[PDB]
Write an enzyme that holds these catalytic residues in place. Sequence first.
Site, short mmCIF file in Angstrom:
data_model
loop_
_atom_site.label_atom_id
_atom_site.label_comp_id
_atom_site.label_asym_id
_atom_site.label_seq_id
_atom_site.Cartn_x
_atom_site.Cartn_y
_atom_site.Cartn_z
N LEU A 125 -1.30 -3.75 10.67
CA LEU A 125 -1.62 -2.38 11.03
C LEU A 125 -0.74 -1.45 10.22
CD1 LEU A 125 -2.83 -0.17 13.00
CD2 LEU A 125 -0.78 -0.57 14.39
N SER A 131 -3.38 5.18 0.36
CA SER A 131 -3.84 5.59 -0.97
C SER A 131 -4.20 4.36 -1.79
CB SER A 131 -2.73 6.35 -1.70
OG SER A 131 -2.43 7.58 -1.08
N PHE A 140 0.49 2.80 -11.09
CA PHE A 140 0.89 1.85 -10.04
C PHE A 140 0.68 0.37 -10.36
CE2 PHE A 140 -0.64 5.87 -8.28
CZ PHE A 140 0.57 6.36 -7.82
N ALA A 141 0.03 0.05 -11.48
CA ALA A 141 -0.33 -1.33 -11.79
C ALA A 141 0.86 -2.19 -12.22
CB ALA A 141 -1.42 -1.38 -12.86
N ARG A 143 3.75 -2.16 -10.45
CA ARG A 143 4.50 -2.51 -9.24
C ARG A 143 4.39 -4.02 -8.99
NH1 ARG A 143 3.61 2.50 -4.86
NH2 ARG A 143 4.81 4.04 -6.05
N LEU A 170 -7.58 7.87 -9.99
CA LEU A 170 -8.87 7.43 -9.40
C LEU A 170 -8.78 7.19 -7.90
CD1 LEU A 170 -9.92 4.80 -12.11
CD2 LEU A 170 -10.85 7.10 -11.89
N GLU A 171 -8.14 8.12 -7.19
CA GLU A 171 -7.70 7.83 -5.82
C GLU A 171 -8.84 7.86 -4.80
OE1 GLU A 171 -4.27 9.92 -4.25
OE2 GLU A 171 -4.48 8.89 -2.34
N1 NAD Z 1 0.25 3.13 -4.69
C1 NAD Z 1 -1.03 3.32 -5.02
O1 NAD Z 1 -1.86 2.23 -5.24
C2 NAD Z 1 -1.64 4.68 -5.18
C3 NAD Z 1 -2.99 4.77 -5.50
C4 NAD Z 1 -3.58 6.02 -5.66
C5 NAD Z 1 -2.80 7.16 -5.50
N2 NAD Z 1 -1.47 7.06 -5.17
C6 NAD Z 1 -0.65 8.30 -5.07
O2 NAD Z 1 0.73 7.96 -5.03
C7 NAD Z 1 1.41 8.70 -4.04
C8 NAD Z 1 1.66 7.86 -2.80
O3 NAD Z 1 2.41 6.74 -3.18
P1 NAD Z 1 2.42 5.41 -2.28
O4 NAD Z 1 1.04 4.92 -2.16
O5 NAD Z 1 3.49 4.56 -2.82
O6 NAD Z 1 2.90 6.05 -0.89
P2 NAD Z 1 3.15 5.23 0.47
O7 NAD Z 1 3.54 6.22 1.56
O8 NAD Z 1 1.98 4.41 0.83
O9 NAD Z 1 4.37 4.24 0.11
C9 NAD Z 1 5.63 4.75 -0.26
C10 NAD Z 1 6.56 3.57 -0.53
O10 NAD Z 1 6.71 2.79 0.64
C11 NAD Z 1 6.17 1.49 0.46
N3 NAD Z 1 5.42 1.13 1.68
C12 NAD Z 1 4.08 1.25 1.95
N4 NAD Z 1 3.84 0.80 3.20
C13 NAD Z 1 5.01 0.40 3.75
C14 NAD Z 1 5.35 -0.12 4.99
N5 NAD Z 1 4.40 -0.32 5.91
N6 NAD Z 1 6.66 -0.43 5.27
C15 NAD Z 1 7.64 -0.22 4.31
N7 NAD Z 1 7.30 0.30 3.07
C16 NAD Z 1 6.01 0.61 2.80
C17 NAD Z 1 5.33 1.54 -0.81
O11 NAD Z 1 5.25 0.30 -1.48
C18 NAD Z 1 6.04 2.63 -1.60
O12 NAD Z 1 7.13 2.11 -2.33
C19 NAD Z 1 0.49 9.86 -3.75
O13 NAD Z 1 0.79 10.86 -4.69
C20 NAD Z 1 -0.89 9.26 -3.93
O14 NAD Z 1 -1.82 10.27 -4.24
C21 NAD Z 1 -0.88 5.83 -5.02
#
Ligand code: NAD
EC number: 2.4.2.-
Length: 204
Positions: A125, A131, A140-141, A143, A170-171
């Site tokens: 959950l 995102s 992000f690819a 990571r 491409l969000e």
């Molecule tokens: N990461 C992606 O695949 C992706 C894709 C499209 C757009 N974005 C964009 O990037 C930004 C958001 O970044 P994000 O996706 O890293 O934000 P996020 O809030 O989902 O995650 C932030 C950080 O916390 C980590 N995280 C995620 N879930 C967690 C959990 N349950 N417990 C502990 N850590 C957790 C992530 O790996 C990341 O390092 C926005 O600007 C969004 O528009 C990200």
Amino acid sequence: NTYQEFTNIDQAKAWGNAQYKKYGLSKSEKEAIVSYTKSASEINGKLRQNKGVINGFPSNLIKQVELLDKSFNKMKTPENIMLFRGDDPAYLGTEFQNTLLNSNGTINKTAFEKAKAKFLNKDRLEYGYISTSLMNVSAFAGRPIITKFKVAKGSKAGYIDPISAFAGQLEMLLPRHSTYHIDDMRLSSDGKQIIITATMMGTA
Ligand SMILES: NC(=O)c1ccc[n+]([C@@H]2O[C@H](COP(=O)([O-])OP(=O)(O)OC[C@H]3O[C@@H](n4cnc5c(N)ncnc54)[C@H](O)[C@@H]3O)[C@@H](O)[C@H]2O)c1
């Protein structure tokens, strides 16, 4: 059932743009989404810290969360689709922050087996919004953890790329309080990433 996987950026953008034109989001909903793309880590971090309870948030953030939630009344995928996401080690738990990666850039195999023991064939959950991207994008690819989500026709999902503050992503946004089931976990061919396959469920 088969899921659509985009393999060409222009084809993905054309599909996404066609979806976005039909949503009919309100001015306030669009404002909430633009701001989300600028402040997602903060918003999602607060949702996780408080287990989805927003009562204690500042009034402007309660309003934004409500508008984001409401937007999904208008935003559904018309087909089975695959979506992609990059995560850093903390995604797996605090215990992985400083153990998941070896010095040479490879995934530590002991940490990988612990991650499988913890998550494989189990529901997860997420209190934050999720995102994702229509394809693996460069932002992000790189990571260490890549997730491929199977999202069924009619599920809440919205292509917000057209009004994102950032280019090239491409969000596709998924709603908060979503549960998914992790079906498979494996090391990539070069051993530098974990690849997760998961089936998206609802927000019950
Ligand atoms: N990461 C992606 O695949 C992706 C894709 C499209 C757009 N974005 C964009 O990037 C930004 C958001 O970044 P994000 O996706 O890293 O934000 P996020 O809030 O989902 O995650 C932030 C950080 O916390 C980590 N995280 C995620 N879930 C967690 C959990 N349950 N417990 C502990 N850590 C957790 C992530 O790996 C990341 O390092 C926005 O600007 C969004 O528009 C990200």
